[PDB]
Amino acid sequence: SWEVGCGAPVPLVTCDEQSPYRTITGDCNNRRSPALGAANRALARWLPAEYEDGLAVPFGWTQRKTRNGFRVPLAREVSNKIVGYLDEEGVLDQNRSLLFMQWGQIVDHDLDFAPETELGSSEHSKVQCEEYCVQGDECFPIMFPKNDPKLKTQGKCMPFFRAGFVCPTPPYQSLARDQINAVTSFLDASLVYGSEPSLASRLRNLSSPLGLMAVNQEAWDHGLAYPPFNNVKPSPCEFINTTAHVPCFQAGDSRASEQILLATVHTLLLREHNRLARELKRLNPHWDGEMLYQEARKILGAFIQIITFRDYLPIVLGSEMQKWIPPYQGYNNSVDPRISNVFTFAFRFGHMEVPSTVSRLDENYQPWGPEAELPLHTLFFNTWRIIKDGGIDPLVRGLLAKNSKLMNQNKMVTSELRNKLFQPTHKVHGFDLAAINLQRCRDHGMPGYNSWRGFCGLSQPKTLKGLQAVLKNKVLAKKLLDLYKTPDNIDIWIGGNAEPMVERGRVGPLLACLLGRQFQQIRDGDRFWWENPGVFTEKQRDSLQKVSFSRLICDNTHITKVPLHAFQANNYPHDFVDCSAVDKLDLSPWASREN
Ligand code: HEM
Numbered sequence: 001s002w003e004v005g006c007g008a009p010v011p012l013v014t015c016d017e018q019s020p021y022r023t024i025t026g027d028c029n030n031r032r033s034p035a036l037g038a039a040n041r042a043l044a045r046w047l048p049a050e051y052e053d054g055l056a057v058p059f060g061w062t063q064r065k066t067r068n069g070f071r072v073p074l075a076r077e078v079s080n081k082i083v084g085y086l087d088e089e090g091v092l093d094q095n096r097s098l099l100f101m102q103w104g105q106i107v108d109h110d111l112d113f114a115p116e117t118e119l120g121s122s123e124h125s126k127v128q129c130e131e132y133c134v135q136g137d138e139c140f141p142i143m144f145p146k147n148d149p150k151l152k153t154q155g156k157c158m159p160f161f162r163a164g165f166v167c168p169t170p171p172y173q174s175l176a177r178d179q180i181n182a183v184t185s186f187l188d189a190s191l192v193y194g195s196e197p198s199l200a201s202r203l204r205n206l207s208s209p210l211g212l213m214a215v216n217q218e219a220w221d222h223g224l225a226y227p228p229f230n231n232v233k234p235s236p237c238e239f240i241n242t243t244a245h246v247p248c249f250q251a252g253d254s255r256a257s258e259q260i261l262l263a264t265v266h267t268l269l270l271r272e273h274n275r276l277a278r279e280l281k282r283l284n285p286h287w288d289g290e291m292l293y294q295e296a297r298k299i300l301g302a303f304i305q306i307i308t309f310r311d312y313l314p315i316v317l318g319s320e321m322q323k324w325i326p327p328y329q330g331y332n333n334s335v336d337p338r339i340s341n342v343f344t345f346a347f348r349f350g351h352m353e354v355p356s357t358v359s360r361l362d363e364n365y366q367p368w369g370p371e372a373e374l375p376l377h378t379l380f381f382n383t384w385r386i387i388k389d390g391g392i393d394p395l396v397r398g399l400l401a402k403n404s405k406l407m408n409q410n411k412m413v414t415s416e417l418r419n420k421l422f423q424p425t426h427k428v429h430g431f432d433l434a435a436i437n438l439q440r441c442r443d444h445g446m447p448g449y450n451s452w453r454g455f456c457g458l459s460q461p462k463t464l465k466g467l468q469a470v471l472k473n474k475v476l477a478k479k480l481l482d483l484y485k486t487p488d489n490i491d492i493w494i495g496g497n498a499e500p501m502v503e504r505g506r507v508g509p510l511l512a513c514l515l516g517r518q519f520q521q522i523r524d525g526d527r528f529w530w531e532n533p534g535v536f537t538e539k540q541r542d543s544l545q546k547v548s549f550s551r552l553i554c555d556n557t558h559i560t561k562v563p564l565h566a567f568q569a570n571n572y573p574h575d576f577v578d579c580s581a582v583d584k585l586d587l588s589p590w591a592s593r594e595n
């Protein structure tokens with residue numbers, strides 16, 4: 001059945017047996033099978049692919065054909081009829097801060113990315129998808145249904161390009177299409193350091209041997225730094241306000257500038273490296289430049305792994321945490337550490353947690369000026385609002401103080417995401433994230449709602465009422481199989497997100513399962529997990545325990561009142577305290593006086 005996984009990546013990476021440092025590619029984590037967990041390779045398949053022609057063609061590609069005897073419903077219509085909502089009033093999650101949403105993206109972007117297919121540059125295929133909405137090749141477009149108001153305003157389709165596949169990027173037929181992953185499967189701060197050895201050596205300041213991450217020369221934030229600008233034109237960030245031409249930020253991940261806030265928590269991560277690396281010459285000046293970068297890298301990875309697993313996962317998984325993430329019991333060389341395909345869709349659950357507006361607060365957590373509260377749609381690829389409109393202190397402040405969206409069945413994904421999305425390649429603020437998610441399922445795999453209900457050993461419904469009592473909504477059950485027509489054909493993203501939430505969490509029975517499994521595998525399979533004996537000295541761990549996001553901001557911003565629990569909804573002034581009462585990171589155990 002194997003062929004035998006194929007693949008051309010970073011053509012040449014061989015291991016060091018006895019060095020304590022991760023590679024950038026993610027190779028040599030596992031000794032036995034050195035590629036497992038690496039980057040630019042196939043996403044894993046917990047379940048066989050489900051295509052029309054059986055190998056590559058997404059369900060609903062040809063007209064005449066059907067998944068299970070029925071015509072699959074258009075993505076934008078499924079969107080139009082189930083997902084969106086008019087009234088923003090009263091969706092905000094009452095026990096979760098914007099940081100809850102925002103750290104969801106950081107962790108995600110650390111774990112998976114399936115790059116879209118541009119076998120196109122100086123090209124007409126980009127044009128043939130945009131202009132003429134002609135399906136074929138790699139242009140698999142999102143049509144508008146009858147009586148969509150995008151028709152009067154935009155056209156017939158939303159261009160949509162198929163994601164990358166392996167063993168060759170050109171046209172090919174054979175096996176079953178597996179989608180590529182351009183980032184390392186481990187929580188290793190790939191998004192801050194890069195995943196391509198070539199990109200990783202460009203984000204660095206090899207000018208001076210303090211082992212520092214290369215910063216911005218031209219823009220400044222009260223003495224505190226910014227990531228460098230990606231000085232390649234064209235620039236999605238320059239496009240949305242040309243008068244100030246401020247390009248996007250350069251980071252270990254392409255997507256760093258997709259949104260204002262994403263770029264903010266990303267500038268906290270960069271600043272933290274240069275602070276640790278600075279602090280670490282202070283103690284052991286005998287060190288060369290790479291042992292600076294590398295030690296600071298290891299401790300920053302430790303940071304992201306500790307916050308993700310101790311503070312985020314329990315408020316996302318909830319009662320199902322103990323079920324899927326049992327306490328730690330060492331390392332397993334036999335576990336697959338890789339991101340499976342379905343995960344790249346299950347973890348998109350956050351798209352229903354993004355609220356309509358992003359606000360900007362002053363030094364008393366009070367609205368910051370005349371235009372404080374900005375619509376989220378004016379914020380995609382917006383770097384000018386942070387270099388030019390006050391730095392990151394008014395944005396870190398909103399993260400701590402403001403609620404995120406609570407996923408609601410009657411209110412699923414905001415219209416700012418579902419109607420006015422800016423897409424980097426294109427010019428309009430009017431793509432649909434909910435619709436673009438649904439085609440993306442069909443592009444990738446992707447076994448229906450029931451296949452994946454079975455994976456977790458849950459009731460696979462069958463009937464209008466067999467769904468009614470699973471989602472606990474009679475109207476949503478109707479709407480769902482009015483379009484899909486059998487519970488089987490429901491795309492995971494919507495089918496999974498449609499379920500009510502498990503006790504003390506933010507996802508449901510199915511999604512808790514898919515999410516839980518992956519997060520356990522990536523912990524149990526990572527040789528460099530912070531708790532495995534060997535990677536940190538027993539002292540170092542006890543200092544690493546003292547860290548919090550609350551501190552990530554006290555050491556790297558001029559915010560001086562913060563919550564003690566930054567992931568849950570709390571109010572200024574009351575729940576906010578001085579940086580002084582917040583535990584610091586004791587870096588003493590990292591000193592190694594030579595003689
Ligand atoms: C305003 C906020 C956000 C915007 C505008 C945004 C934008 C996007 C866009 C344009 C895509 C491309 C979809 C595709 O072509 O595959 C994407 C994918 C994705 N999003 Fe978001 N995003 C946001 C926040 C989040 C959050 C909070 C999470 C999780 C908590 C998240 C999780 C993901 C994941 C896992 C993918 C697929 C990436 C992969 O290939 O692994 N996003 N996002």
Ligand SMILES: *[C@@H]1O[C@H](CO)[C@@H](O[C@@H]2O[C@H](CO)[C@@H](O[C@@H]3O[C@H](CO)[C@@H](O)[C@H](O)[C@@H]3O)[C@H](O)[C@H]2NC(C)=O)[C@H](O)[C@H]1NC(C)=O
Binds near residue numbers: 212
């Ligand atoms: C790589 O690291 C070097 C060394 O840390 C960076 O250069 C240093 O940058 C700081 C702050 O940008 C400079 O400090 C101050 O400069 C201002 C104005 O230029 C001046 O008013 C003060 O006299 C003060 O020195 C400093 O010039 C410079 N330090 C040294 C020893 O060169 C460099 O920016 C880093 N490169 C990248 C890409 O990050």
Ligand SMILES: *[C@@H]1O[C@H](CO)[C@@H](O[C@@H]2O[C@H](CO)[C@@H](O)[C@H](O)[C@H]2NC(C)=O)[C@H](O)[C@H]1NC(C)=O
Binds near residue numbers: 095315565
């Ligand atoms: C708001 O959410 C928080 C976090 O989900 C809840 O506090 C947790 O309570 C559980 C139950 O014993 C414990 O595992 C933790 O000690 C708490 N979490 C943290 C981070 O300390 C809290 O109950 C919720 N608040 C309200 C008013 O419902």
Ligand SMILES: *[C@@H]1O[C@H](CO)[C@@H](O[C@@H]2O[C@H](CO)[C@@H](O)[C@H](O)[C@H]2NC(C)=O)[C@H](O)[C@H]1NC(C)=O
Binds near residue numbers: 240241242243244384
């Ligand atoms: C483009 O960006 C500039 C900032 O570089 C914005 O300019 C501000 O605009 C307001 C009112 O027009 C002024 O009162 C501020 O002083 C301006 N700031 C500076 C220093 O330029 C501008 O609003 C943006 N325009 C677009 C196209 O959205």
Ligand SMILES: *[C@@H]1O[C@H](CO)[C@@H](O[C@@H]2O[C@H](CO)[C@@H](O)[C@H](O)[C@H]2NC(C)=O)[C@H](O)[C@H]1NC(C)=O
Binds near residue numbers: 332334335
């Ligand atoms: C490492 O973890 C794996 C997966 O949890 C364990 O694999 C199991 O091994 C037992 C017997 O060795 C087999 O019956 C099953 O094939 C595995 N279970 C499942 C459901 O995956 C393994 O036990 C662990 N390795 C060790 C020896 O600690």
Ligand SMILES: [Ca+2]
Binds near residue numbers: 111183185
């Ligand atoms: Ca990673």
